[PDB]
């Protein structure tokens, strides 16, 4: 009986794979980007990447290849999952809908076999005769491509070589032939076999096993024109083919290992090479033509081209463009030129995509000190290290604050017919109208000609022909720029009001009730045109001359009031077209027609806060999509605002919301604001690119943030951040950091570039004498980062070979100071495990960093929380509790010894603690007895932990080694000595991510209990919450209903995916819910959504409301 819920807050952003080809059309260039469980399909364009399709799969993508057999009009896609799900995919565009269809699938894991060296490798023959897998040592699995084999049946062949580094299929080979680098005793070797599938054996390869260098790792199979194989080692590159043998050993490449490649030119004249450094190389093969003799290979050379992000994945695209898949850093779109720039680089970045990278550690802070957490991650590694500040929502910056408990509308006002700046904001009021002349930045309420102050303005637009309108309770007044008085003024042929106002900068379309007139601000006078009567009372109206119309406006739309409807119409005629019947007893408060890039949009807000959304047609215009949200609980006013190239829709509610744009879609993110009642663009000479926004009581004006649901602000550290703490009193962060350095010829160590610790504002080194006794090395630092500016205020460098692994910001003992304590450790590469380390206690003062105390240890300090005014640490395998002498020193109180390796600890308010490396988790208490540890209980399973949390008094979350999550609790049980001494795994669940950090916090607010945020190696940020048994049960059920209804991509079974799994056991998931899947619900059609129900009560869209309520936890 454990009941948890897990959702993704941020999808993985690291890039594991990327592959290029024609997957969308025979004539289309696509870049397929593989995150972890996310496949991203693009079309390469002049601008770069046209997003087209983003699906998620039920597994971690380990293999991703495009291929095209015969008769096949375009490329199909092969994908192997890490749980050995193999599938084959096809891009299907049902004219206007899109689908990725599974042409074949099946699971290719084998009970036999130990997962090999260099991990899964999936290759595919040039002729497409088969697919070659290397899942295990000794085996080589072959999946024969045939029209059938829709279940991907496969055979294994025995592989004599038990240790294969890399393999490819050779080109221009009659028989399917593989080429591989393998390792034995006495070096590495390149060797070949034909693959005859009609016998299920191998056969001899075309060329004799040559040798390759000790560190050979990549095999490139050169295309048909050249044929053969390139082998890439350290400091050396070689070419093999039959008796042909070519070798270069360019000094330049010794510096760092080549990690990745890519064919640039189809013939393979040219390849890209990726470095551990981020260096980019061109590999060039000098061809050679000899009449009556196809071609040969005279030479090959390497040229340094420049520098990218550390590249996992490289892919030449169109002309000089290269996509850079990055895992340690931000991914990027990059450009190659024939000419280098200034210090010498042929590489020029074009676009950078944000990778929250490896989140190595993180922490929550409301920096703005409101009631929302921002989250602050140590990210990336080496040159890509960064902090990322992550903040939900879209904010605005407030410039004035005028108390006006009334404002019932407001429109812009340029008082000078030249400047695109306005100096007035005439504003509807509680049955009034106030004008507002501005002295630039100042505020002033005065009169204005032909604009009634006694009456309630319902509009105020920017009517052309040198005129200013003010439509009122009564009727459309008129004022000039030239005359500036009472130029004209309409009035209802009966002394009845205008109910609903309209106007763009050229039209006027009011309503009287059921009535629908039409007036014009023609040169200096308002002339009448049409009149039509409607079934019911006009609720709301919209007109704006969309695209192909200068001021004068095409078709129309309206919501009415007893038949709560929205309908499509024309202009002077009012001829009714298609329509829609929305439900309930609440009338449409607002209707809208818009545009962004390539669609004309229609939305309709109701008084319950909900909104229905649809698209119209400038040419025709009819019905579109039908979905239903929950923005405010209050009626929503829709409006459109000035921003970047794509100006957008702002929704006014108790939950202010922006509606931007996705692919060609539209964003739905919160605006970080109390409540916005009405809202409009502005620009005054004293307030430019400003937005105006009145609430219950107050005008406000300011710019906008980004757009997404999450805003991220990066602090480039240029080295690898490791741990991170917030010392509030000091208004700064502590960050442990590590920089790499190389052996000097003095013997010392230099540095490869300026980092955050070398460009530090001030600085200091360890003096401490506790110890006495090319080549690369780490230099470690505590950095002091201002919380507002994110400047490195101070840098404290630790000793030669001292890694700093843990950090806390705490007060200790009676002592009233907040210290920064750092646990460290002396690492020497030969050693298995450090035997020496220290704890160091520091204070950061006015702007100072004092070494307040040190403390020898006989190990590596892995973690340390602040217990109860004491410092609980943890060294190599011993867990301790330090007391702070009044004499200001850390002295031992007690220690627990029964650990293989204590890596993590957390503290449940009370005297309770938890953690371990290969042996899952322990629970400990502090006994104010003799002041001792009592080991309360442990989990008796072989979990190699990576992260540990306490969700509550009895519930412990755990993440491990194998991308699983688990929960333990203490066994409430008779025989309270053994059953008591044991805690049971009451929840299991395969996440699919490696978790580095849990911490309590949330990114949201100012059903569910708790909020635990987690930070993963892939850039994925998730959330774990707790549930009621009934909520659990509701959701479990609905989890299963949902799986019947939803087509999973490669036809992977959801529950196969979520299955707690190791290469020693596989159990199904218990006590866990992916809201990821629950949430999936809303993307479903109401038909397929009805099925989800057939059965305290049962409903058809009660659940639609349960699920909404959830999406808002993050």
């Amino acid at each position: 009986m454990s009941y948890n819920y897990v959702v993704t807050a941020q999808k993985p952003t690291a890039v594991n794979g990327c592959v290029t080809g024609h997957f969308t059309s025979a004539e289309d260039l696509n870049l397929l980007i593989a995150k972890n469980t996310r496949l991203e399909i693009y079309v390469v364009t002049a601008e770069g990447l046209r997003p087209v399709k983003e699906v998620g799969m039920y597994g971690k993508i380990a293999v991703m290849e495009l291929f095209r057999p015969k008769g096949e009009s375009k490329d199909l896609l092969f994908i192997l999952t890490a749980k050995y799900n193999a599938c084959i995919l096809e891009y299907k565009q049902s004219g206007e809908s899109i689908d990725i269809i599974t042409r074949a699938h099946g699971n290719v894991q084998d009970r036999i076999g130990r997962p090999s060296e260099t991990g899964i490798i999936g290759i595919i023959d040039p002729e497409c005769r088969m697919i070659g897998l290397r899942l295990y040592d000794g085996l080589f699995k072959v999946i024969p491509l045939d029209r059938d084999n829709k279940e991907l049946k496969a055979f294994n062949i025995r592989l004599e070589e038990l240790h294969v580094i890399d393999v490819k299929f050779l080109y221009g080979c009659q028989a399917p032939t593989i080429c591989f680098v393998y390792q034995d005793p006495q070096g590495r070797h390149v060797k070949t076999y034909e693959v005859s599938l009609r016998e299920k054996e191998f056969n001899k390869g075309p060329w004799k096993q040559e040798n390759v260098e000790a560190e050979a790792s990549m095999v490139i199979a050169v295309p048909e024109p050249f044929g053969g194989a390139i082998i890439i080692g350290q400091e050396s590159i070689t070419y093999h083919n039959g008796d042909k043998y070519l070798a270069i050993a360019p000094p330049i490449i010794k510096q760092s290992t080549i990690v990745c490649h890519n064919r640039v030119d189809p013939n393979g004249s040219r390849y890209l090479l990726g470095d551990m450094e981020g260096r980019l190389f061109m590999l060039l093969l000098e061809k050679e033509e000899q009449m009556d003799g196809t071609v040969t290979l005279k030479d090959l050379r390497v040229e340094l081209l420049g520098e990218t992000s550390i590249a996992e994945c490289l892919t030449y695209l169109d002309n000089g463009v290269v996509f850079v898949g990055s895992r340690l850093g931000d991914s990027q779109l990059v450009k190659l030129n024939v000419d280098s720039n200034e210090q010498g680089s042929y590489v020029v970045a074009m676009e950078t995509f944000t990778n929250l990278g490896p989140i190595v550690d993180m922490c929550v802070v409301d920096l703005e000190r409101q009631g929302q957490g921002q989250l602050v991650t140590c990210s990336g590694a080496f040159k890509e290290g960064s902090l990322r500040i992550i903040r939900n929502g879209i904010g605005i910056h407030e410039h004035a604050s005028i108390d006006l408990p009334g404002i019932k509308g407001l429109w812009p006002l340029r008082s000078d017919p030249n400047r695109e700046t306005y100096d007035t904001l005439v504003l509807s009021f509680v049955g009034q109208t106030r004008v507002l002349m501005l002295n630039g930045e100042e505020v002033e309420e005065t009169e204005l000609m032909g604009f009634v102050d006694d009456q309630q303005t319902f509009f105020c637009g920017n009517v052309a022909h040198q005129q200013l309108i003010q439509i009122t309770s009564a009727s459309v007044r008129l004022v000039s720029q030239e005359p500036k008085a009472l130029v004209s003024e309409w009035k209802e042929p009966q002394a009845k009001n205008i109910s609903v106002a309209s106007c763009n900068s050229s039209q006027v379309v009011v309503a009287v009730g059921r009535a629908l007139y039409y007036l014009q601000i023609h040169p200096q006078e308002l002339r009448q045109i049409s009149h039509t009567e409607m079934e019911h009372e006009v609720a709301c109206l919209d007109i704006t001359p969309l695209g192909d119309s200068n001021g004068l406006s095409p078709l129309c739309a309206i919501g009415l009031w007893t038949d709560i409807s929205a309908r499509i119409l024309k202009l002077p005629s009012f001829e009714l077209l298609h329509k829609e019947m929305l439900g309930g007893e609440i009338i449409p408060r607002s209707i809208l027609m818009t545009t962004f890039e390539s669609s004309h949009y229609l939305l309709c807000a109701l008084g319950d806060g909900a909104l229905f959304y649809f698209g119209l047609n400038i040419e025709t215009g009819l019905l579109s999509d039908r979905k239903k949200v929950t923005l405010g609980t209050q009626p929503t006013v829709l409006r459109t605002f000035r921003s970047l190239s794509t100006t957008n829709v702002f929704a006014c509610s108790d939950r202010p919301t922006v509606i931007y744009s996705s692919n060609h879609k539209l964003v739905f993110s919160n605006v970080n604001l109390k409540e916005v009642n009405y809202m409009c663009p502005l620009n005054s000479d004293g307030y430019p690119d400003s937005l105006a926004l009145a609430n219950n009581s107050t005008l406000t004006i300011g710019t906008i943030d980004e757009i997404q649901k999450l805003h991220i602000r990066t602090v480039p550290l240029y080295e690898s951040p490791r741990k991170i703490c917030y010392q509030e009193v000091s208004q700064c962060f502590g960050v442990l950091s590590s920089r790499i350095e190389v052996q000097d010829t003095s013997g010392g160590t230099t540095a490869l570039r300026p980092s955050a610790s070398t460009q530090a504002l001030s600085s200091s080194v360890s003096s401490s004498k506790l110890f006495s006794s090319g080549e690369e090395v780490e230099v470690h630092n505590l950095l002091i980062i201002d919380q507002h500016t994110f400047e490195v205020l101070h840098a404290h460098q630790f000793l030669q070979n001292e890694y700093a692994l843990s950090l806390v910001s705490c007060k200790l003992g009676k002592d009233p100071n907040t210290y920064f304590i750092v646990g460290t450790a002396m690492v020497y590469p030969e050693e298995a495990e450090p035997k020496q380390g220290r704890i160091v206690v520091f204070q950061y003062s006015d702007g100072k960093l004092q070494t307040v105390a040190e403390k020898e240890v006989k190990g590596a300090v892995y973690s340390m929380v602040e217990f109860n005014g004491k410092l609980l640490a943890s060294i190599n395998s011993t867990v301790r509790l330090y007391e702070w002498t009044t004499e200001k020193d850390v002295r031992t109180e007690c220690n627990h010894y029964n650990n293989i390796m204590a890596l993590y600890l957390k503290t449940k308010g009370d005297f309770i603690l938890v953690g371990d490396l290969m042996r899952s988790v322990l629970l400990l208490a502090y006994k104010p007895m003799e002041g001792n540890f009592e080991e309360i209980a442990r989990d008796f399973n072989p979990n190699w932990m990576s992260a540990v949390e306490i969700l509550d008094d009895d519930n412990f979350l755990g993440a491990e080694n194998a991308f699983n999550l688990f929960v333990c609790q203490k066994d409430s049980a008779a025989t309270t000595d053994e059953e008591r001494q044991h805690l049971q795994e009451v929840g299991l669940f395969h996440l699919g991510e490696f978790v580095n950090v849990f911490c309590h916090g949330s990114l949201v607010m100012q059903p569910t209990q708790g909020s635990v945020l987690f930070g993963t190696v892939n850039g994925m940020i998730g959330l774990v919450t707790s549930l009621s048994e009934s909520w659990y049960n509701l959701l479990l059920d609905m989890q299963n209903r949902l799986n019947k209804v939803i087509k999973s991509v490669g036809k992977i079974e959801h529950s196969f995916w979520r299955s707690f799994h190791t290469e020693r056991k596989t159990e199904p998931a218990t006590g866990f819910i992916d809201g990821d899947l629950i949430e999936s619900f809303l993307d479903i059609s109401r038909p397929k959504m009805q099925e989800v129900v057939a059965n305290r009560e049962a409903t058809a869209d009660d659940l639609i409301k349960v699920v909404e309520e959830l999406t808002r936890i993050h």
Partner: peptide, 13 residues
């Protein structure tokens, strides 16, 4: 050196 391995593990593969 297992400390180095763990540091490597946090940055994965």
């Amino acid at each position: 050196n297992i400390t180095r391995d763990l540091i490597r593990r946090q940055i994965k593969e």
